[PDB]
């Protein structure tokens, strides 16, 4: 199952970091948007994209020869064949916290941005817990 | 954790089993039959000349001169080896032509060619079925179907042989299990796997009732016609032609060309939607060398001969009926099969306690028959691996080149030999 | 003249960014988005300096 | 583990920029695939893909859409590289039927033109036994006339012939083992003889990059399967120690058997297995060895007995010696060799021997003639010049590719030469540009390779003269200049 090892390959981490940097630059490119709102939009878009591509879309784009072990499993549970802690998983859990710290730094610590940013960070963070593995809240996206 | 010294002791004291267990059983299968010359009608076996009643060569196309000439021309043009898979410069023009001929012969959109008779169905089954799906398979399916089903980790639910009420009961229970949990029922695929003409028992499946059940309970049908591809129907198109069922109602038809066409390989025919997927998801197709062009040309010429003259099916039918009616009446053997079946079985009526003694009795009958110049064989199975083990039996196979007098003499010889042995 | 060098450079651009495989209208869509992004970035950068 | 001749191999790491650009390309392709799927969903654009017949719309959909995503968008765009029909003997030069597509590779129409004289880097024919003339062809024709094409029953019942017995005895003499057996297809050989040996309660240590057939055979039997790193002897030793010490997973009971599946030459990576160390480990830890010599039966070795001759070892050490006739000898089929007791047990209990049709007579005669030619029994020096020419060809070709600056994998003796492309679009670009310059090659992707390493395979042969190699090398040099494929940092 190659999909398991794609996050372990060479250059994936640097590609991810460059992608986030490019996303922030393109957000900066818009003329009228002010800086704290730029940072908030960067954080929100990054968290929503990470959530969609990790915990919502399940299965494998390519057909798999193990007769569909990962049929019901999302990418996060698919990573490293269920091993809870690894370098890639630690890095993926670490990075959004750093992004939120930076965003709250460049947004001057206002409440209105803080509530949205905290909600986004919690949304992306809760599925990462090893305790929350293979469970769907209220049975949504179960099948 | 363990000390290092304990690790050395544990590694040192371990002693494994032998790679292969000893075979002290005087296993009869260890004594192969040695055939001198072609395995055709009027062959030679073990140094004795015999009339061939054992080889699955129904139409007698093994030694037809036109087939040999076509194969020779293909040999002189292409060579023997294909030197690659179907993906990597291994596809020839003869392969495409053969696929087209098969598709036009079965009145179907697309057909696919496999280089081995077992691999075709054993790789077609797991291509479409994955884990979590349900498959309702007949109890007496051949070994290839069983290995194919085991390859796909889906759920298997056997049902009694040619018992349609039993399949209906199983389907109703599955309907209840779907009623309990709709979410899973939205994702679970249902298949029904059957054989056109069963090899183990020599009976024919009830296709119309199967079609009605498919359209009622929504389960896709897979048909395996290894034995009925070139023997059943007026035009010899299979069991669908025999019953009158339209070819579209069946999702996939698989058959090996070893038996009727007398050349190596198999094929699967169906609508383009289902067939196009095997070219990528068929393990026997992607990761294996293509069929040599020689055998492909032999198959093409066999198809031309089959299409030109369709009276061979009629003469085969009359011969099968005659031998089935002649063999009835033996002292201590029962005939298992239907009149229209080319290959059927002879089994014991009164079975002794052990199976190995029944095998020895049948081998006695076979040997004493072969000493009278009728070559017969015995059905061979793997006792440990077979899911449902059929009783031991002598296999009788009918062919177009056998005359009427040879059939009468075979019946009389078998009857007298059996009445001598069993009594 | 310079046309051959520029044609080679555009070939390399298509090869690297996987635009080679795509149908002609997909290339047009991608190029339009890219040039729009560059234009807005340049204008927002220069207006301030 | 004594290496009597130096063991050299090279697996260069991917440069960072190439990896980053590979990921960028794959991401763009995935996004446009999603956009195409969304456009097709609302019936904005009609789908060329075949659809369900109308009165089967209520049934659960046969395929999950996401499963075919990679096929629908990634694969279909460059489909014209694969499945190229040929209309001649697959020798050094092959004739390809030219085809074109008007709907972007969904449907293909054959034009009248036939591309003649294509240099054939795709077909195996390592020793160049793929010809339509010679003594092999005449012998095959004679046996075809005498026996007919095909046999109509399994080996155990009536399908055993005298030709099969002659072939089995000849193979037994050829390898050096006591006994051997032959099967119709190599894939069948693996997938039908692995389950007979090991059952539930045994451990199968399998290489990471093993062929699909070996994996299928391991899965069919109930044995537990564990995977070690590709040619990492430390990893293999660690797995063996742990397996013997701890035992079966649920109930810590001693294993019945431990079987090691390895290959003589890995087709994709092109590396030769480290056989002496594997045999030393097998002896020390009381395991059994299953050696798959599909790609190395003819190519490797001074006299072509296989990898075991290449290392100068003793064939009685390997417990099971599998092999295939397709790659070198120029005919389909497979074989398994070993001690006499193993072969008796296989003849009794193999799935193929019971439920599968025997091997065709003309094919076995072609195999017999080719083997007699290699063994020096033909009376001519044609079985020796083949091996010498193959060795020199591989040396020259590998050295020249390394001098120009590409990235080449594998051992320095391996005939199969994988060249690295590393990018998705460059695969199709390389295939189309190469065939345009009158050389046919093969390129591979996900169903055989990982994501970063997408490669093109050259299969050298003894049929290739020097002039053919010179022209092919010049055209590869020009294409590499054109497509910027010279990634190697050391020598360029
Ligand atoms: C971004 C877009 C990417 C698209 C790429 C998609 C793609 O690559 C599709 C590929 C289409 C066809 C794939 C063919 C795969 C071949 C694998 C190869 O290893 C074969 O298995 C060979 C030759 O068949 N194996 C021979 C072999 C056997 C079986 O031999 P036979 O019984 O004679 O057929 C058994 N064991 C072993 C070890 C081998 O090698 C091969 O090795 O070339």
> What is the domain count for chain C?
1
Q: How many CB atoms lie within 10 A of CB B345?
A: 23
- Burial status of residue D4 (CB atoms within 10 A of its CB: 0-12, 13-18, 19 or more): exposed
Whose structure tokens read 């498959």?
B135
What is the distance in A from the centroid of ligand 1 to the CA of D209? 12
CA–CA dist A115, A120 (Å, integer): 9
Give C16 to chain D, closest Cα distance, Å: 7
Q: For D68, left (φ over 0), alpha (ψ -120 to 50), or beta?
A: alpha
- b/e sequence A124-140, b meaning 16+ C-beta within 10 Å: beebeeeeeeeeeeeee
**DSSP character for D271?**
P
Q: Which residues of B touch D71 (CB under 8 A)?
A: 280
Whose structure tokens read 């070795």?
D301
Angle at D79 between CA B248 and CA B283, to 5 degrees: 60
**DSSP character for B230?**
T
Q: For B411, left (φ over 0), alpha (ψ -120 to 50), or beta?
A: alpha
What residues form DSSP beta bridges with B114? B266
Helices (H), B337-403: 355-370
C44 in A contact zone (CB under 8 Å): yes
Chains in contact with B, where contact requires at least 3 CB pairs less than 8 Å apart: A, D
Can you tell me whether residue B113 is helix, strand or coil?
strand
Residue among D213, D252, D280 at smallest CA distance from D3? D280
Q: Which residues of A touch D63 (CB under 8 A)?
A: none
Contact B337, B324 (CB under 8 A): yes
The domain in which residue C35 lies consists of 23-49
CB contact under 8 Å between B126 and A68, yes or no, is no
Angle at D219 between CA D215 and CA D225, to 5 degrees: 80
User: CATH 3.30.465.10: does it fit domain D135-374?
Assistant: no
Contact D448, D268 (CB under 8 A): yes
Q: How distant, in Å, are the alpha carbons of B219, B224, D281, D410, D412 from that of D7?
A: 57, 51, 18, 11, 8
Q: Which tokens in the block code for residue B220?
A: 């896709």
| D187: enclosing H helix or E strand | helix D186-197
Contact B71, D149 (CB under 8 A): yes
Asked if residue C32 is part of any domain, the answer here is yes
| DSSP string of B248-272, one letter each residue | GG-SEEEEETTSSS-SS-EEEEE-H
CA–CA dist D107, D210 (Å, integer): 34
CB contact under 8 Å between C22 and D32, yes or no, is yes
CB contact under 8 Å between A26 and C44, yes or no, is no
Does the CA dihedral B34-B39-B41-B43 come out positive or negative?
negative
Q: Which tokens in the block code for residue B130?
A: 């994955």
CA–CA dist D433, D443 (Å, integer): 12
B287 lines ligand 1 (CB under 6 A): yes
In the sheet that holds B374-375, the strands lie side by side as B43-45, B48-52, B374-375
Cα first-last separation, chain C: 37
Q: Tally the C-alpha atoms within 13 A of residue A58's C-alpha that lie toward its C-beta.
A: 16
Can you tell me whether residue D369 is helix, strand or coil?
helix
CB contact under 8 Å between C44 and A29, yes or no, is yes
CA–CA dist B398, B124 (Å, integer): 29
Asked if residue C44 is part of any domain, the answer here is yes
CA–CA dist B35, B48 (Å, integer): 9
CB contact under 8 Å between D351 and B385, yes or no, is yes
Q: Residue ranges of the domains in chain D?
A: 16-77, 135-374
Length of chain B: 423
What residues form DSSP beta bridges with D338? D179
Whose structure tokens read 């990471």?
D208
D88 in B contact zone (CB under 8 Å): yes
Give A12 to chain C, closest Cα distance, Å: 17
Whose structure tokens read 């990059």?
D209
CA–CA dist B199, B336 (Å, integer): 11
Residue among D374, D377, D396, D399 at smallest CA distance from D387? D374
CB contact under 8 Å between D140 and B88, yes or no, is no
CA–CA dist B65, A42 (Å, integer): 78
- b/e sequence A64-97, b meaning 16+ C-beta within 10 Å: beebbebbbbbbbbbbbeeeeeeebbeebeebbe
CA-closest residue to ligand 1 atom 19: D267
CA–CA dist D206, D448 (Å, integer): 17
> What experimental approach yielded this model?
cryo-EM
Give D168 to chain C, closest Cα distance, Å: 50
Q: Which tokens in the block code for residue D121?
A: 């880097």
Q: Which residues of A touch C43 (CB under 8 A)?
A: 31
CB contact under 8 Å between D67 and A11, yes or no, is no
For strand D288-292 and strand D320-324, is the pairing parallel, antiparallel, or unpaired? parallel
D136 in B contact zone (CB under 8 Å): yes
Helices (H), B328-395: 355-370
In A26-85, the residues whose Cβ lies within 8 Å of chain C are 26, 28-31
Ligand 1 pocket test, pick from D206, D208, D213, D410 with the greatest ligand atom count within 8 Å of Cβ, gives: D213
In the sheet that holds D455-459, the strands lie side by side as D416-420, D455-459, D442-443
- Torsion from C-alpha of D295, D298, D299, D303, nearest 10 degrees: 150
In the sheet that holds D258-263, the strands lie side by side as D179-183, D334-338, D320-324, D288-292, D258-263, D203-207, D224-228
Angle at B394 between CA B389 and CA B398, to 5 degrees: 120
The domain in which residue B87 lies consists of 65-308
Q: What are phi and psi of D100, to 5 degrees?
A: -135, 160
The radius of gyration of chain C from alpha carbons, rounded to an integer in Å, stands at 14
Residue among B119, B99, B163, B40 at smallest CA distance from D158? B40
Residues 6 or more apart whose CB falls under 8 angstroms from that of A4 comprise A78, A79, A80, A81
Pick among B125, B126, B127, B130 to test the A interface (most A CBs inside 10 A)? B130
Asked if residue C5 is part of any domain, the answer here is no
Give C4 to chain A, closest Cα distance, Å: 31
Does the CA dihedral D129-D132-D138-D139 come out positive or negative?
positive
- Burial status of residue D436 (CB atoms within 10 A of its CB: 0-12, 13-18, 19 or more): exposed
Q: Which tokens in the block code for residue B105?
A: 């012969």
CA–CA dist C35, B284 (Å, integer): 49
CA–CA dist D457, D415 (Å, integer): 10
Q: How many CB atoms lie within 10 A of CB B379?
A: 19
Ligand 1 pocket test, pick from D69, D77, D126, D326 with the greatest ligand atom count within 8 Å of Cβ, gives: D326
Angle at B109 between CA B254 and CA B310, to 5 degrees: 70
Q: Tally the C-alpha atoms within 13 A of residue B82's C-alpha that lie toward its C-beta.
A: 26
Cα B321 to chain centroid distance, Å, stands at 22
Contact B167, B213 (CB under 8 A): yes
CA–CA dist B267, B271 (Å, integer): 14
Ligand 1 pocket test, pick from D444, D446, D459, D460 with the greatest ligand atom count within 8 Å of Cβ, gives: D444
- Burial status of residue D284 (CB atoms within 10 A of its CB: 0-12, 13-18, 19 or more): exposed
| DSSP string of D391-419, one letter each residue | HHHHHHHHHHHHHHT--B-SBTT-SEEEE
Asked if residue C11 is part of any domain, the answer here is no
Residue among B201, B213, B255 at smallest CA distance from B233? B255
**DSSP character for D298?**
S
Asked if residue C7 is part of any domain, the answer here is no
D447 lines ligand 1 (CB under 6 A): yes
Do C and B share at least 3 CB pairs under 8 Å? no
D107 in B contact zone (CB under 8 Å): no
Pick among A67, A69, A73 to test the B interface (most B CBs inside 10 A)? A67
Cα B120 to chain centroid distance, Å, stands at 11
Q: Which residues of A21-120 form beta strands (DSSP E)?
A: none
């Amino acid at each position: 199952n190659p999909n398991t090892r794609v996050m372990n390959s060479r250059g994936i981490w640097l590609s991810y970091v460059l992608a986030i940097g490019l996303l922030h630059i393109v957000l900066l490119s818009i003329p009228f948007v002010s800086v704290p709102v730029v940072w908030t939009l960067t954080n929100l878009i990054h968290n929503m994209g990470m959530y969609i591509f990790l915990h919502t879309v399940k299965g494998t784009p390519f057909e798999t020869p193990d007769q569909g072990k990962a049929r019901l499993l999302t990418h996060w549970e698919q990573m490293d064949y269920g091993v809870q802690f690894t370098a890639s998983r630690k890095f993926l859990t670490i990075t959004p916290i750093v992004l939120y710290f930076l965003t709250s730094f460049y947004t001057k610590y206002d409440q209105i941005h803080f509530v949205l940013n905290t909600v986004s960070l919690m949304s992306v963070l809760i599925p990462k817990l090893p305790q929350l593995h293979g469970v769907r809240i209220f049975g949504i996206n179960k099948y | 954790d363990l000390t290092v010294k304990e690790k050395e002791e544990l590694i040192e004291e371990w002693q494994p089993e032998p790679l292969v267990p000893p075979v002290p059983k005087d296993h009869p299968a260890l004594n192969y039959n040695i055939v001198s010359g072609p395995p055709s009608h009027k062959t030679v076996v073990n140094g004795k000349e015999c009339i061939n009643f054992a080889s699955f060569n129904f139409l007698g196309l093994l030694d037809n001169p036109r087939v040999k000439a076509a194969a020779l021309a293909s040999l002189k043009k292409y060579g023997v080896g294909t030197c690659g898979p179907r993906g990597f410069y291994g596809t020839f023009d003869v392969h495409l032509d053969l696929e087209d001929r098969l598709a036009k012969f079965m009145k179907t959109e697309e057909a696919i060619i496999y280089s081995y008779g077992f691999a075709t169905i054993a790789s077609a089954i797991p291509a479409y079925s994955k884990r979590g799906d349900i498959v309702f398979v007949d109890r007496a399916a051949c070994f290839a179907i069983q290995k194919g089903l085991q390859a796909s980790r889906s759920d298997i639910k056997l049902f009694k042989h040619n018992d349609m009420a039993d399949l209906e009961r199983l389907l109703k229970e599955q309907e209840i299990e779907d009623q309990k949990n709709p979410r899973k029922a939205r994702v679970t695929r249902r298949f029904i796997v059957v054989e056109g003409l069963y090899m183990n028992t020599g009976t024919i499946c009830p296709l119309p009732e199967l079609v009605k059940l498919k359209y009622k309970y929504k389960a896709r049908i897979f048909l395996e016609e290894s034995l009925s591809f070139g023997v059943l129907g007026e035009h010899g198109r299979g069991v669908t032609e025999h019953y009158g069922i339209n070819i579209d109602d069946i999702d996939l038809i698989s058959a090996n060309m070893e038996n009727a066409l007398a050349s190596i390989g198999g094929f699967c025919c169906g609508r383009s939607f289902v067939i196009d997927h095997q070219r990528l998801s068929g393990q026997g197709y992607c990761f294996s060398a293509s069929l040599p062009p020689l055998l492909a040309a032999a198959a093409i010429e066999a198809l031309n001969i089959m299409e030109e003259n369709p009276g061979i099916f009629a003469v085969l039918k009359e011969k099968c009926g005659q031998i089935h009616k002649a063999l009835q009446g033996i002292s201590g053997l029962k005939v298992v099969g239907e009149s229209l079946s080319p290959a059927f079985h002879l089994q014991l009526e009164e079975s002794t306690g052990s199976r190995e003694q029944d095998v020895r009795l049948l081998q006695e009958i076979v040997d004493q028959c072969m000493n009278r110049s009728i070559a017969l064989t015995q059905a061979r199975y793997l006792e440990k691996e077979e899911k449902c083990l059929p009783p031991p039996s002598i296999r009788v196979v009918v062919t177009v080149e056998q005359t009427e007098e040879e059939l009468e003499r075979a019946a009389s010889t078998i009857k007298e030999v059996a009445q001598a042995v069993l009594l | 003249r310079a046309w051959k060098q520029m044609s080679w450079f555009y070939y390399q651009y298509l090869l690297v960014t996987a635009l080679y495989m795509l149908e002609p209208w997909e290339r047009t869509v991608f190029n339009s988005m890219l040039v729009s992004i560059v234009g807005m970035a340049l204008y927002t950068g220069y207006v301030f300096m | 583990g004594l290496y009597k001749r130096p063991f050299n191999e090279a697996f260069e790491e991917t440069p960072m920029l190439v990896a980053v650009l590979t990921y960028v390309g794959y991401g763009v392709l995935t996004l446009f695939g999603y956009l195409r799927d969304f456009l097709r969903y609302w019936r904005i654009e009609k789908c060329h893909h075949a659809t369900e017949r109308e009165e089967q719309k209520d049934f659960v959909s046969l395929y999950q859409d996401f499963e075919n995503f990679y096929t629908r968008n990634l694969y279909m765009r460059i489909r014209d590289n694969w499945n190229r029909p040929i209309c001649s003997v697959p020798g050094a030069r092959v004739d390809i039927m030219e085809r074109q597509s008007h709907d972007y590779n969904w449907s293909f129409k054959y034009t009248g033109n036939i591309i003649k004289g294509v240099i054939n880097m795709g077909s195996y024919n390592y020793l160049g036994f793929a010809r339509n003339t010679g003594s092999c062809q005449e012998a095959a024709a004679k046996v075809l006339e005498e026996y007919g094409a095909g046999v109509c029953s399994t080996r155990q019942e009536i399908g055993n012939l005298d030709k099969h017995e002659e072939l089995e005895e000849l193979v037994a003499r050829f390898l050096g083992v006591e006994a051997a057996m032959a099967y119709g297809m190599g894939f069948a050989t693996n997938s039908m003889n692995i389950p007979a040996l090991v059952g539930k309660g045994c451990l199968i240590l399998s290489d990471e990059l093993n062929h699909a057939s070996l994996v299928l055979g391991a899965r069919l039997s109930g044995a537990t399967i564990r995977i070690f790193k590709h040619n990492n002897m430390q990893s293999l030793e660690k797995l063996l120690k742990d397996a013997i010490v701890y035992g079966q997973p649920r109930t810590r009971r001693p294993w019945k058997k431990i079987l090691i599946l390895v290959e003589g030459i890995y087709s994709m990576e092109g590396s030769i297995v480290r056989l002496p160390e594997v045999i030393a480990l097998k002896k020390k830890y009381k395991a059994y060895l299953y050696l798959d010599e599909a790609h190395s039966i003819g190519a490797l070795g001074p006299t072509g007995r296989g990898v075991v001759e290449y290392f100068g070892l003793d064939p009685e050490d390997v417990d099971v010696m599998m092999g295939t006739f397709t790659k070198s000898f120029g005919a389909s089929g497979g074989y398994i060799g070993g001690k006499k007791e193993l072969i008796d047990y296989l003849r009794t209990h193999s799935h193929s021997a019971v439920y599968a049709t025997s091997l065709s007579p003309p094919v076995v005669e072609q195999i017999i003639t080719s083997m007699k030619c290699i063994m020096g029994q033909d009376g001519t020096s044609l079985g020796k010049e083949c091996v010498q020419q193959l060795a020199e060809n591989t040396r020259y070709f590998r050295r020249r590719l390394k001098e120009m600056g590409f990235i080449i994998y594998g051992n320095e003796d391996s005939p199969v030469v994988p060249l690295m492309l590393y990018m998705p679009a460059k695969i199709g670009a390389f295939g189309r540009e190469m065939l345009k310059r009158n050389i046919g090659v093969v390129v591979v992707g996900f169903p055989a390779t990982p994501i970063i390493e997408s490669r093109a395979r050259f299969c050298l042969s003894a049929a290739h003269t020097k002039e053919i190699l010179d022209t092919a090398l010049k055209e590869i040099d020009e294409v590499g200049d054109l497509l910027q494929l010279k990634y190697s940092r050391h020598r360029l």
